[PDB]
Structures are given as C-alpha cells and as structure tokens.
Design a protein around this ligand. Structure first.
Ligand SMILES: Nc1nc2c(ncn2[C@H]2C[C@H](O)[C@@H](COP(=O)(O)OP(=O)(O)[C@H](F)P(=O)(O)O)O2)c(=O)[nH]1
Ligand SMILES: [Cl-]
Ligand SMILES: [Cl-]
Ligand SMILES: [Cl-]
Ligand SMILES: [Cl-]
Ligand SMILES: [Cl-]
Ligand SMILES: [Mg+2]
Ligand code: NA
Ligand code: NA
Ligand code: NA
Length: 326
DNA sequence: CCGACCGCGCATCAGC
DNA sequence: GCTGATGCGC
DNA sequence: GTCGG
C-alpha cells in the first residue's frame, strides 16, 4: 500500500489492455511494472525515480508523474467514461468470459448482469457457473476458512487412498492471510513420468469430494486437472459460506518439486523465474527443468530433489514461498 | 533499432 | 472421428 | 510497454 495509488493505476491499465485492446504483452508490461513498484520499499516521489526500476519505462514514468501531480490519470478517466470499454471490462469479470466472448456479448447488446441472467442459453457451461456464483467468486477467503478447507480435502483424500498426497499451494502456501481460491496439488505413487499404473486417479478424488458435498460444481475436468467449485459446510441456523473456486492438479509423483514450485507461484513470479531460466539457458515447466541446446531445443530433464535444486540450476538464491508473492 | 515477451490443461470449434 | 488453432484460465 | 544486444 506504500505506493498503492500507482500500482492500482497500472493494474487498471493492465486490465484495460488485456480485456479491451486484447494486447497481452502490454498487459504483462503493466503487470510487471506494478509488481516491481509494489516491492519497492520507498514511497515514490517521481516518474524518474520509478524509471530506475526494471519494467518501468518512459511511458509509465510519465504516467506516474501525471498521477503524482493530480491524483489521477486522464487516460483512465476517459476509459471509465467509455461505455463499450466499461461493458467489456465488466463482463470479463465473469469466470469463463474472456476478452473475445466479452466483446461478442456486447456486440449482441448483452452488457449487464441482468442481460447475462436472461440469456443463460447463450453461455457455455463454465460461463454458466461463473454467472451463478458471480458474487461469491468476488469474495476472498480468510486463511481461517482455507485451513478448514484444507482439513476436509486432505482427510477426504486420505479416505480414498492413504497413498495420496494433497498439498495446498497458491497464496496459501506463500503464507497469505487470505486467498482468492484454493489450489491443491495432488500426487499418488501409481502415477509417475514413467507410467500410469492406475486410472481415474483424479476422478476418484473428485468423486469423494462431491460425495460429501464439498465440491458442488465442475468448470472443467480432465485426467490431470480439475477446475470447479466447493463450499464449507455450515452449522445449524448459520448462514451458508460463499461458494469458492477450487483447482486440483494431479502431477507425476517424481515431478513433485517442479509441480509444487509451479502451483505456489505467484504467476508473476513464475514468469520472472522461467524468463530468467531462459537467460541462463534452461526451460522450466510444471514437470521438468531442461537445458536448451545451442539450437534452443529442450534437452532431457535434469535431476531435481528439492525446490532449491531448481533455483540452483538458474543460479538464483533460494526464495521461500512467502517471498515469491510478486 | 527490433524481436522476444512462460508454459500448458481443458473446452470448443473449423476443416478434413 | 482426428488434428490443429484458439479462448480462457491456471 | 520495456529491455537487451
Ligand atoms: N507459469 C505460470 N503459472 C501460473 C500462471 N497463472 C497461475 N499460475 C500458477 C501460479 C499460481 O500461484 C498458481 C495458482 O493460480 P492462482 O491464479 O490461483 O494464483 P494464486 O497465486 O493462488 C493467487 F494469489 P490467489 O488465488 O491466492 O488469490 O498457478 C501463469 O500465467 N503462468
Ligand atoms: Cl501486445
Ligand atoms: Cl485515475
Ligand atoms: Cl521435480
Ligand atoms: Cl517436460
Ligand atoms: Cl514460506
Ligand atoms: Mg489461488
Ligand atoms: Na527502468
Ligand atoms: Na472472465
Ligand atoms: Na486457481
């Protein structure tokens, strides 16, 4: 919050570029600048001061000057007044409606919450569930609820098969006092890079969580990734908890450390880290870290025994999850 | 300059 | 059906 | 929009 004013501005600009201009590199450019500035341990006093930070260029430096002088940005003022941009920005808040779908809906004169509701038949399944829980999915989850949710998921998974290991990642693993959703990494010894010795590994876990009425909706589901909806159980007479987004990612057990690094994030941290990997001549995904041949062809997976081995390869000092919140 | 910008699972569609 | 590109979300 | 070379 030290430079919250500026970081909010850049985020609003990032969002505009993603949702409206559909210009994803501009989106990431703003996001990066915002991240670098939020980290910065001084209250910024000028665009020039900011332009010292990596990712802040001439254009963002000028905007910071405008913002510092007036408390606002004319460019954003006009964006907010623009009915089309506002409408598009709103619709993209519904899970499953991206920039493209949003702009189409608006072309059809579907541009409000009331419009979506009376046009349920125009929505695919994911979008349908995003509209249903539009309000709930806006709310954050107190760590205390995250802790109850973890207890359920782990215990239920243990009931299915004691050899399952479920690890809650995302901001929860980074120590955050609230999380926008729940991210669960799942492994089982029968699923490795070498073989899948047991089918329905993910399905069976999902099934059991539906059985106890923890999972209530499915956004999408495949052999290794589930994205859906869950809800804590509430006591007699007490108001129900909000429905929450959940994702479960089944990863080969022998690739746990690359998987847990991936699912811990943050997203910006992953981008920064894989970008650095590339500078050092490696490529990192949720499975492996591989060298890049002189051609730039990924080589064979390097041995990984801890998250720190991954950091080591790219010559980064290790960073605890709680210091990966970029 | 100017090319590169992380990497990939699932849904959905076009074209064969 | 299949492959491949695209959207969208992680 | 920014940066590396
Ligand atoms: N390489 C890469 N990894 C990505 C990306 N988006 C999400 N991830 C990874 C890292 C997240 O922590 C993890 C979960 O994705 P997330 O969107 O839930 O983020 P998160 O870190 O959990 C948020 F802080 P919260 O949800 O708690 O409010 O998925 C992406 O674009 N690229
Ligand atoms: Cl772009
Ligand atoms: Cl403003
Ligand atoms: Cl690994
Ligand atoms: Cl791989
Ligand atoms: Cl930590
Ligand atoms: Mg999360
Ligand atoms: Na800079
Ligand atoms: Na959306
Ligand atoms: Na998630």
């Amino acid at each position: 919050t030290l430079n919250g004013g500026i970081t909010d501005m850049l985020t609003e600009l990032a969002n505009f570029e993603k949702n409206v201009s559909q210009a994803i590199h501009k989106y990431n450019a703003y996001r990066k600048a915002a991240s670098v500035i939020a980290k910065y341990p001084h209250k910024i006093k000028s665009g020039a001061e900011a332009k010292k930070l990596p990712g802040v260029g001439t254009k963002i430096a000028e905007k910071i000057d405008e913002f510092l002088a007036t408390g606002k940005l004319r460019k954003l003022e006009k964006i907010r007044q623009d009915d089309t941009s506002s409408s598009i920005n709103f619709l993209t808040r519904v899970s499953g409606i991206g920039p493209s779908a949003a702009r189409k809906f608006v072309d059809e004169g579907i541009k409000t919450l009331e419009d979506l509701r009376k046009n349920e038949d125009k929505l695919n399944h994911h979008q349908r569930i995003g509209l249903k829980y539009f309000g709930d999915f806006e709310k954050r989850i107190p760590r205390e609820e995250m802790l109850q949710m973890q207890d359920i998921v782990l215990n239920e998974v243990k009931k299915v098969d004691s050899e399952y290991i479920a690890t809650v990642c995302g901001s929860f693993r980074r120590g955050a006092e609230s999380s926008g959703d729940m991210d669960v990494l799942l492994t089982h010894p029968s699923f490795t890079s070498e073989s899948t010795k047991q089918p329905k590994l993910l399905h069976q876990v999902v099934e059991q969580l539906q059985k106890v009425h923890f999972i209530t909706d499915t956004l999408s589901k495949g052999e290794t990734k589930f994205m859906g909806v869950c809800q804590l159980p509430s006591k007699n007479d007490e108001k129900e908890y909000p429905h929450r987004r959940i994702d479960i990612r089944l990863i080969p057990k022998d690739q746990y450390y690359c998987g847990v690094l991936y699912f811990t994030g943050s997203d910006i941290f992953n981008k920064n880290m894989r970008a650095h990997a590339l500078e050092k001549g490696f490529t990192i995904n949720e499975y492996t870290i591989r060298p890049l041949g002189v051609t730039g062809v990924a080589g064979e997976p390097l041995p990984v025994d801890s998250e720190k081995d991954i950091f080591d390869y790219i010559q980064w000092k290790y960073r605890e999850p709680k210091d990966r919140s970029e």
